[PDB]
Write a protein that binds this ligand. Structure first.
Ligand SMILES: CCCCCCCCCCCCCCCCCC(=O)OC[C@H](COP(=O)([O-])OCC(O)COP(=O)([O-])OC[C@@H](COC(=O)CCCCCCCCCCCCCCCCC)OC(=O)CCCCCCCCCCCCCCCCC)OC(=O)CCCCCCCCCCCCCCCCC
Ligand SMILES: CCCCCCCCCCCCCCCCCC(=O)OC[C@H](COP(=O)([O-])OCC(O)COP(=O)([O-])OC[C@@H](COC(=O)CCCCCCCCCCCCCCCCC)OC(=O)CCCCCCCCCCCCCCCCC)OC(=O)CCCCCCCCCCCCCCCCC
Ligand SMILES: CCCCCCCCCCCCCCCCC[C@@H](O)O[C@H](CO[C@H](O)CCCCCCCCCCCCCCC)COP(=O)(O)OCC[N+](C)(C)C
Ligand SMILES: CCCCCCCC/C=C\CCCCCCCC(=O)OC[C@H](COP(=O)(O)OCCN)OC(=O)CCCCCCC/C=C\CCCCCCCC
Ligand SMILES: CCCCCCCC/C=C\CCCCCCCC(=O)OC[C@H](COP(=O)(O)OCCN)OC(=O)CCCCCCC/C=C\CCCCCCCC
Ligand SMILES: CCCCCCCC/C=C\CCCCCCCC(=O)OC[C@H](COP(=O)(O)OCCN)OC(=O)CCCCCCC/C=C\CCCCCCCC
Ligand SMILES: CCCCCCCC/C=C\CCCCCCCC(=O)O[C@H](COC(=O)CCCCCCC/C=C/CCCCCCCC)COP(=O)(O)OCCN
Lengths: 178, 603, 459, 156, 128
């Protein structure tokens, strides 16, 4: 989510992703902790018996039969964490998230309540206003010609600088706003 | 004068005052949920009086108070039928609603829109009362559609979640399919009986034909989630647990069975529709119990249990025992609502975790929920002298001794075994093992709201069957004499289901693992019915809606035929007429030609 | 009837002599007063009619249409106030003049006692609408839209005129009372078949009938908000009123001449409804829903039974109010977002909750939730169709389901889900917009209390 | 702000206009593939894979997280058909044909067995229920001026 | 060996079962790299427009405009009358009308004949 993606997944990443998926589905099959521990140790032993192999061709022939075997026995109803994309509370609090800019449209009788909050908000706004003019040029000179090659962003390198394109990441609504 | 009518109307009327006050200052404060809860408790206490009057004598009433309109020979008026069914169902619904509101005061404490949520619950209760007390088909349709709209609004409570909106639209779709049959029945009765009033319909229909009864059966199957139109009820578990306990467990989903019960005088004169109802109920209860047997979400297990119980109610209707079906509705209300409250208590205590894989030893960790769920599971399986006994045991006996399908009877017995099996599954995977939840233990039962709300329905699910059965008049011929093995059949199949489920669940501890079989995959994916039927038809509809109706016909061929052809022809004729070089040579040659033609053609 | 006509005419000098900053206030106040005056036409008899003079008469079919026409004008003024802010005073006065002239032409058309007079005003309604569409429309398609809206209409109505004068040379009169009292059967003949077609096609094309409806989406998506309101709420019902009036001289030919249209309607209502399932424009979706409802009205009129006529009248009134409200909601989104695409502005319930409530009520009314008068009309039409043939229920039933789907679709795409992140110019709803929605929706729920007012002369 | 040349156009016939169309839809020319040049007016629009929006990555930082779309990327012709609220094409644990066979077989078997049970019902070893007054002639319908044929019941 | 998964239109192939992801070539890597490059360029453009303090308006998306235009207004100029389009239009626009006409006409003829013979039993049928 936070990390920028690459152009492709290497062989090691694919193997590790299979290992995690297989362990999770084995846990979903083996409900009890001791049974899961036993079969997960067995799966670890099965997984690293080809850990030391050198050639790419058969190492890719493995992890293909492994995917087929996983898809045959994949527990059609695996356990999902409730906040995960398949969980029972995935986007439950999405309706309570309100953008910050809505506060700019409040009535003055509403802003009269919470004066300290809005003073701090004005401070944040002026900080953003200066930092943006710096950030545009920083990104302009830090980018290779022909455009970006990866959607990864640089940090700030000067003293009073801020990381380019920081406002909408720092001012996230919240995980549970209401 | 005769306080019966005044009391019956006052209950429904005072149910509406908090809706009027929803724009007052109380709605903006934190006392509104308690206001609604107190109003519902007062309404329950008031409605207890006409039930006593009917129990003493048998008081029955029709109140046609407001005249709405008159289409020539058809008079439509606001009429209420205060019969046995109404005066028996209103107290039960109000009792369950009071318990659910007290439970929600604890369950939804951190919800910002709890006042709106309480208001929504009261609106559903009002619509359901309108449905239950209606005397004509139009008022019944008003309640029918009101409960559906409230279900749509409460399923999609968290409107930022895509799945909730999908489930709400699914419920609307299936209930609209049932609404087709409802409208068919209304049109038939208006055209043939010249009435939507129930009395004239009963008078003029001594041998009811197939069409109106088939329409009524379609509507009942739609709203009670029978096998053809079943998946929306399990999908409706997207809503908050109080919604699942109130609407989609015990009160709203029995509306189709209630519709079939209201029209029972016409149903007993038709044998084909009775057989259709029997087969539909049997297949529904079997299929839903089979699906429930392998589920891992606890709310899904309870929802499939509700669907199988509704199928059993339809089986009871099919063998011409409507009062037994009403009694089963009343008992199921109690124990199913309490089961859902216990499940919601577990879910809240385990940080909104619903999978039974991640709940272990709760028998000692939270004892009150354990006892309540144990008593509810015993009541659901028809333990003798409990609330579910007095309906389920009689239903099983009646199906055993009747001239009916052998297949439907076998399916009913197998479904009873499967009911015992999934009750065993819930208990075994939620209470008996070692803990399997995250290390930060936040388990807490000590809230008086939760305890009292659960305890009232506990007392109900223990004693209500005895009280109600002993306080109602006999409405059918009993099955006094029976073979000994036939008398014990329900208990025998329940014990066999218990034993087989326990034996199969005890093998999960063995240190052996194997891949699942085809039957398990069929049971886990709900017979693959949601997959195919939610992917093949919808796609083939939507694709057509863009390719043929919109693009090929509307945007191309209808455009080609009238306007484009006219434009093309007129433009070509304009080019033909106006493209002249301006040479008098050709003009005067043409003049000569027309002069000759006029000379030699028009005379 | 002049107690309504003369003040409507006096609206024009009042508009033109008004101050530059007081045109909207005066127009709104006096239009509301004219609506209050026109409310008195609702007192109808079970007997013939309210025959005021030789030129104008009123019926319980004409009275609700007149009340709706007079009520729509203040709402149109309120809706037009916003997007006409930067316009010169003379052009604003011209806009208000076009609206007033349209109201005058409609008022007279509904109450005219002569078929020729009715034809003249029925055509006079075209010029203000065409000017409004092609002058104050926003996109470049408006010109083409206007052309369609014109020629379709004229292509249907030029034969009617011929038929009309022919009738007056045979019966000797085109007065509706005499025509009704001296009606004679139409024999099955080719000449009679073509007379039937000439008398029917002009009203079919303005409903619009399926297959002749191509002008309506263009006109409704290209018009300004007031133009869309008046087109959907009142101008569609002119064809229904005309067919209700003229079918008295077409019997018993209608018994078998109605078959091609009935099919075209019964299948057509399916197609258009399904079209609403795959639409990327809000106004286009609302226009296609209007086409489906008017197909049901066409079926009701062709069935020619008392329940059919009652249902058709009720459905006409209900659809007028509902479609006007839906167009106003879509425009209130458009003036913030300037796109008119459904999936651009999303999750608006979080940012505008009361407007979301208005959206819900409008969608529920379009969905025909009982006891709304939308459902009353739909159910009466469905019962009459079932008596006509029991198989019709199938198609009718299907339509019902589909309608709900797309209605809720429109509610879910725009109001639910997550808000669009980059759209940061969604301001709080103004009192004007909320009042507009309230003044749309309160009359519907009030009318459900006295449905006899909108059930027509066969009640 | 979109120019006239940035709109969809007619079917590309030459590689140069093919490459021009690919650049207009922000995609590689190797990945660009228009609809077949049939009658229907797809025209210049690109034919993207028929995968649903539900099978897109949920852990990516989409600009539109609910639709799982990115600003500027080409939109599938049938996006409104696949919006996670509608038909999805995600892979299933069991193959489509196997699911269809199993569901159809279960339904057909249940129908056949219900018909078999209709032919072979279940009942108890009893005779018909007996009712006193000419099988309740007067109380069931009536017609008290016809003197029905008397039916007398057998005491055993 | 295990039973094979068979993909379909409505149940597509898993990415982990694609042989195309196991046939890695330098050209494939270059294609992936340039696809990521164009995605990164579009993301940078959007995020520059999105984080700008000065901007106070909906960001215009050319892709969305192209989608709506192609779905609505680019249809007819690219329409060509072909045997396939002609046949499909004739079927989908004419066949249903005549099918429903036949069904309804047969039903009404049956009802009319029954009424004329008097054997229909329309008792209590007062409202129509
Ligand atoms: C008349 C005499 C009366 C006396 C009768 C005899 C008394 C009783 C004798 C007992 C007989 C059997 C009872 C045991 C039940 C089976 C248990 C079992 O072994 O399951 C494990 C075993 C494999 O499971 P697994 O892969 O290891 O699961 C992985 C983990 O265990 C995952 O585990 P988990 O933790 O996730 O969940 C465990 C769950 C998961 O288990 C499952 O997968 C569920 C599947 C098994 C239960 C299904 C039973 C319901 C049967 C209804 C069938 C109706 C017709 C449908 C037709 C289908 C057509 C396609 O299992 C359970 O919860 C318990 C299962 C049920 C036990 C409790 C009730 C059983 C008794 C009730 C039935 C008989 C008494 C009725 C009383 C009335 C008196 C007659 O399941 C099977 O192999 C199925 C066995 C039987 C299925 C027959 C259907 C095959 C159809 C193939 C096609 C044939 C040709 C058709 C052609 C048609 C052409 C049109
Ligand atoms: C039911 C009995 C009620 C008795 C008490 C009095 C009720 C007065 C109702 C007045 C008429 C509706 C007014 C609509 C405009 C609302 C304006 C507004 O923004 O209020 C905000 C205000 C302040 O809230 P807020 O904090 O600004 O809200 C923030 C957000 O906007 C959040 O806002 P929200 O989430 O609170 O949204 C408002 C809320 C409620 O808002 C609405 O939905 C309003 C529209 C509901 C109906 C939609 C059309 C359906 C066809 C109705 C045709 C019958 C009309 C009857 C005559 C009406 C005369 C006006 O949404 C809903 O709860 C969904 C309603 C679904 C109703 C489904 C069932 C409808 C048929 C029920 C049967 C009726 C006949 C029974 C016949 C047999 C027995 C006699 O809250 C309210 O006032 C809500 C009022 C409670 C809803 C009343 C629903 C029942 C009344 C239906 C019509 C009158 C029936 C009279 C006979 C009753 C027996
Ligand atoms: C395009 C989008 C839709 C627009 C609206 C469409 C609605 C208009 C449809 C016109 C309604 C039908 C017109 C005539 C119906 C009369 C019945 C007759 O046609 O059927 C048979 C007639 O047989 C044949 O039809 C003869 C005529 C055949 C030639 C007509 C052309 C057929 C198709 C043309 C369709 C073109 C429509 C669009 C024009 C641009 C009956 O046999 P018969 O008993 O002997 O005649 C009875 C009539 N009598 C008593 C006067 C003698
Ligand atoms: C409240 C506080 C005020 C207390 C003072 C009043 C105390 C009671 C005195 C009332 C006097 C009697 C009265 O109300 O007048 C009768 C009058 C009826 O007028 P009639 O002409 O006689 O009949 C209708 C046909 N024209 O009754 C009433 O209007 C009041 C009672 C109406 C019932 C409540 C209506 C609620 C439902 C709203 C309509 C919903 C849609 C319709 C659904 C139809 C279903 C088939
Ligand atoms: C016998 C004669 C019958 C006469 C029928 C009269 C039909 C009335 C419309 C005639 C318009 C014909 C002219 C025309 O459309 O030209 C094509 C024109 C070219 O554009 P221009 O503006 O001329 O040039 C722009 C570039 N500088 O294309 C268009 O714009 C078409 C838009 C107008 C069509 C609108 C709809 C008209 C057809 C609707 C159906 C009614 C047909 C009436 C007759 C049908 C038979 C009963
Ligand atoms: C009759 C219905 C004919 C088909 C109607 C097609 C309508 C297409 C438009 C619907 C809009 C698309 C849509 O709703 O999305 C599909 C949506 C999403 O699927 P989920 O599984 O919930 O996914 C959530 C988790 N990701 O699913 C649905 O809601 C679609 C449901 C369609 C049901 C069609 C099958 C109905 C068959 C009825 C047969 C039974 C007849 C009656 C039997 C009773 C006997 C008296
Ligand atoms: C949206 C576009 C729709 C375009 C309009 C479609 C309707 C066309 C209706 C026919 C047009 C002419 C109507 C005639 C006016 C009525 C007068 C009448 O009925 O008198 C008849 C005359 O009837 C005719 O002459 C009509 C002949 C038709 C000539 C014009 C052809 C127009 C096109 C015909 C086919 C299309 C009609 C349906 C189109 C469907 C919609 C596209 C009797 O004449 P007499 O000789 O005095 O009496 C006989 C005993 N001696």
């Amino acid at each position: 989510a936070f990390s920028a993606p690459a152009a492709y997944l290497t062989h090691q990443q694919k193997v590790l992703r299979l290992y995690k998926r297989a362990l999770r589905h084995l846990e979903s099959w083996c409900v009890h902790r001791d049974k899961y521990r036993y079969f997960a140790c067995l799966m670890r032993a099965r997984f690293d018996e080809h850990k030391n192999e050198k050639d790419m061709v058969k190492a890719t022939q493995l992890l293909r039969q492994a995917e087929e075997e996983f898809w045959y026995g994949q527990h059609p109803q695996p356990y999902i964490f409730p906040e995960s994309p398949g969980g029972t509370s995935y986007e439950r609090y999405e309706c309570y998230k309100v953008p910050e800019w809505c506060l700019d449209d409040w009535h003055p009788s509403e802003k009269a309540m919470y004066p300290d909050y809005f003073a701090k908000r004005e401070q944040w706004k002026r900080l953003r206003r200066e930092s943006w003019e710096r950030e545009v040029k920083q990104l302009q000179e830090e980018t290779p010609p022909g455009g970006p090659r990866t959607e990864a962003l640089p940090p700030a390198r000067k003293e009073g600088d801020l990381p380019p394109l920081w406002w909408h990441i720092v001012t996230r609504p919240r995980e549970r706003p209401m | 004068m005769n306080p019966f009518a005044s009391l019956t109307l006052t209950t429904l009327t005072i149910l509406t005052i908090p809706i009027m006050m929803s724009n007052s200052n109380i709605y903006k404060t934190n006392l509104y949920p308690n206001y609604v809860k107190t109003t519902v408790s007062y309404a329950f206490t008031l409605s207890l009086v006409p039930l006593l009057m009917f129990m003493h004598t048998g008081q029955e009433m029709i109140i046609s108070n407001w005249h709405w309109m008159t289409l020539q020979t058809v008079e439509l008026s606001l009429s209420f039928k205060m019969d046995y069914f109404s005066v028996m169902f209103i107290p039960v619904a109000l009792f369950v609603t009071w318990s659910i509101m007290e439970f929600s005061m604890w369950y939804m404490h951190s919800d910002p829109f709890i006042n709106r949520f309480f208001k929504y619950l009261l609106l559903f209760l009002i619509t359901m009362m309108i449905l239950v007390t209606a005397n004509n088909l139009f008022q019944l349709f008003i309640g029918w559609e009101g409960v559906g709209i409230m279900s749509f609004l409460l399923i999609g409570w968290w409107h930022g979640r895509t799945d909730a909106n999908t489930a709400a639209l699914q419920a609307i779709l299936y209930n609209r399919i049932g609404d087709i049959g409802f409208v068919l029945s209304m049109a038939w009765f208006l055209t043939h009986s010249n009435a939507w009033d129930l009395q004239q319909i009963f008078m003029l229909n001594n041998e009811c034909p197939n069409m109106p009864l088939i329409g009524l059966l379609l509507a009942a199957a739609g709203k009670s989630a029978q096998f053809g139109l079943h998946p929306w009820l399990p999908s409706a578990m997207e809503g908050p647990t109080p919604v699942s306990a109130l609407l989609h467990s015990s009160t709203m989903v029995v509306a189709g069975v209630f519709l079939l019960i209201r029209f029972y005088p016409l149903m007993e004169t038709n044998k084909l529709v009775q057989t259709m109802t029997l087969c539909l109920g049997a297949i529904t209860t079997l299929f839903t119990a089979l699906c429930a047997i392998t589920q891992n979400d606890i709310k899904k297990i309870v929802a499939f249990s509700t669907s199988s119980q509704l199928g059993l109610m339809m089986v009871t209707i099919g063998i011409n025992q409507p009062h037994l079906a009403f009694l089963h509705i009343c008992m199921h209300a109690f124990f199913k609502a309490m089961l859902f409250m216990c499940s919601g208590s577990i879910i809240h205590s385990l940080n909104d975790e619903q999978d039974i894989r991640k709940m272990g030893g709760l028998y000692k960790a939270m004892p009150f929920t354990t006892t309540a769920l144990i008593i509810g599971s015993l009541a659901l399986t028809g333990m003798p002298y409990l609330t579910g006994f007095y309906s389920k045991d009689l239903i099983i006996e009646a199906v055993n001794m009747s001239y009916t399908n052998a297949w439907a009877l076998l399916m009913t017995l197998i479904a009873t075994s499967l009911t015992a099996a999934y009750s065993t599954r819930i208990i075994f995977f939620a209470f008996l093992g070692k803990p399997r939840f995250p290390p930060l233990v936040l388990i807490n039962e000590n809230n008086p709201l939760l305890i009292n709300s659960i305890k009232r329905l506990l007392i109900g699910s223990i004693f209500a069957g005895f009280i109600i059965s002993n306080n109602i008049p006999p409405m059918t011929v009993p099955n006094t004499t029976m073979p000994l093995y036939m008398k014990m059949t329900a208990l025998i199949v329940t014990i066999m289901g218990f034993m087989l489920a326990l034996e199969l669940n005890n093998t999960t501890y063995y240190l052996k693992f194997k891949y699942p079989s085809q039957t398990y995959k069929f049971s886990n994916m709900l017979g693959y019915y949601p997959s195919i039927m939610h992917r093949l038809p919808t796609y083939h509809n939507l694709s057509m809606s863009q390719k043929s109706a919109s693009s090929l016909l509307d945007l191309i061929w209808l455009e080609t035929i009238l306007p484009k052809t006219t434009s093309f022809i007129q433009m070509k004729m304009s080019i033909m007429v106006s493209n002249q070089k301006g040479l008098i040579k050709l003009y005067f040659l043409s003049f000569l030609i027309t002069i000759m033609i006029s000379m030699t053609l028009f005379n | 009837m002049l107690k309504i006509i003369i003040p409507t005419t006096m609206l024009l000098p009042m508009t033109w002599m008004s101050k530059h900053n007081m045109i909207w206030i005066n127009a709104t106040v006096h239009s509301l007063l004219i609506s209050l005056i026109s409310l008195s036409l609702l007192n109808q008899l079970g007997e013939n009619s309210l025959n005021f003079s030789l030129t104008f008469f009123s019926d319980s079919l004409s009275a609700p249409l007149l009340v709706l026409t007079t009520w729509l004008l203040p709402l149109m003024l309120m809706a037009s106030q916003s997007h006409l802010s930067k316009e010169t005073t003379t052009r604003k006065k011209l806009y208000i003049t076009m609206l007033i002239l349209l109201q005058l032409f409609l008022i007279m058309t509904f109450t005219a006692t002569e078929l020729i007079l009715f034809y003249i005003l029925f055509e006079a309604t075209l010029v203000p609408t065409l000017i409004i569409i092609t002058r104050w429309g926003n996109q470049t398609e408006r010109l083409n839209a206007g052309l369609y809206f014109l020629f379709y209409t004229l292509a249907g109505s030029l034969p009617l005129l011929v038929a009309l004068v022919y009738i007056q040379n045979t019966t000797g009169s085109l007065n509706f009372l005499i025509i009704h009292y001296w009606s004679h059967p139409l024999s099955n003949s080719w000449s009679n078949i073509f007379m039937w077609l000439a008398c029917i096609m002009a009203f079919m094309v303005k409903m619009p009938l399926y297959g002749l409806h191509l002008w309506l989406p263009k006109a409704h998506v290209e018009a300004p908000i007031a133009g869309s309101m008046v087109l959907a709420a009142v101008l569609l019902k002119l064809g229904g009123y005309g067919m209700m009036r003229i079918t008295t001289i077409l019997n018993p030919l209608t018994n078998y001449m109605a078959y091609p249209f009935l099919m075209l309607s019964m299948w057509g209502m399916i197609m258009t409804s399904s079209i609403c399932l795959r639409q990327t424009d809000l106004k286009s979706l609302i226009a296609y829903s209007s086409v489906s409802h008017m197909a049901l009205v066409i079926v009701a009129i062709m069935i020619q039974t008392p329940w059919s006529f009652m249902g058709a009248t009720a459905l006409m009134i209900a659809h007028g109010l509902t479609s006007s409200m839906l167009f106003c909601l879509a425009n209130t989104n458009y003036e913030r977002v300037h796109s008119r695409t459904m999936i651009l502005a999303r999750g608006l319930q979080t940012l505008l909750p009361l407007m979301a409530t208005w959206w819900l009520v409008a969608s529920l009314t379009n969905l025909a939730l009982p006891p709304s008068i939308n459902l009353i009309g739909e159910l009466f039409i469905i019962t009459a169709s079932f008596s006509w043939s029991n198989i019709t229920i199938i198609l009718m039933g299907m339509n019902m389901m589909i309608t709900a789907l797309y209605s809720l679709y429109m509610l879910i795409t725009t109001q639910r889900g997550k808000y669009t992140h980059h759209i940061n110019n969604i301001k709080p709803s103004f009192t004007r917009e909320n009042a507009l929605m309230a003044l749309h929706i309160l009359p519907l729920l009030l009318l459900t209390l006295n449905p006899k007012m909108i059930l027509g002369p066969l009640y | 702000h979109v120019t006239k040349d940035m709109f969809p156009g007619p079917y590309p016939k030459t590689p140069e206009e093919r490459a021009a169309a690919a650049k207009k839809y922000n995609m590689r020319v190797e990945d660009y593939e228009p609809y077949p040049d049939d009658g229907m007016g797809y025209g210049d629009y690109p034919k993207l894979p028929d995968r649903s929006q539900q099978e897109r990555d949920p852990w990516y930082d989409w600009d539109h997280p609910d639709l799982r779309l990115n600003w500027g990327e080409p939109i599938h012709w049938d996006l409104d058909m696949y919006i996670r609220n509608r038909v999805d094409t995600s892979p299933t644990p069991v193959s489509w044909n196997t699911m269809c066979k199993h569901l159809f077989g279960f339904v057909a078997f249940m129908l056949f067995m219900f018909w078999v049970g209709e032919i072979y019902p279940s009942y108890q070893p009893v005779g018909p229920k007996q009712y006193p007054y000419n099988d309740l002639y007067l109380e069931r319908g009536g017609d008290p001026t016809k003197e029905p044929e008397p039916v007398v019941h057998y005491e055993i | 060996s295990f039973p094979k998964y068979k993909p379909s239109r409505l149940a597509t192939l898993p990415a982990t079962l694609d042989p195309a992801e196991y046939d890695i070539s330098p050209e494939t890597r270059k294609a992936q790299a340039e696809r990521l490059a164009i995605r990164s360029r579009l993301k940078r453009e959007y995020l520059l427009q999105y984080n700008d303090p000065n901007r106070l308006g909906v960001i215009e998306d050319p892709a969305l405009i192209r989608w709506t235009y192609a779905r609505s207004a680019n249809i007819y100029p690219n329409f060509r009358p072909t045997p396939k389009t002609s046949l499909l239009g004739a079927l989908f626009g004419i066949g249903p009308l005549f099918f429903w006409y036949y069904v309804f006409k047969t039903d009404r003829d049956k009802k009319e004949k029954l009424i004329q013979e008097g054997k229909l039993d329309q008792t209590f049928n007062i409202s129509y």
